[PDB]
């Protein structure tokens, strides 16, 4: 979704990585 696209920003962080 267009709102879920904001969750992709976390992938850049070390928490998601």
Q: Which method, experimentally, gave rise to this model?
A: NMR
Distance CA 8, CA 1 (A): 11
CA atoms within 13 A on the CB side of 2: 0
Distance CA 5, CA 3 (A): 5
DSSP 8-class letter at 6: G
- The structure tokens 């879920």 sit at 4
Distance CA 15, CA 8 (A): 12
Q: Which two tokens stand for residue 3?
A: 């709102």
Q: Let me know: does 11 contact 17? Beta carbons within 8 Å.
A: yes
């Amino acid at each position: 979704r267009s709102k879920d696209l904001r969750h992709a920003f976390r992938s850049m962080f070390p928490s998601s990585e």
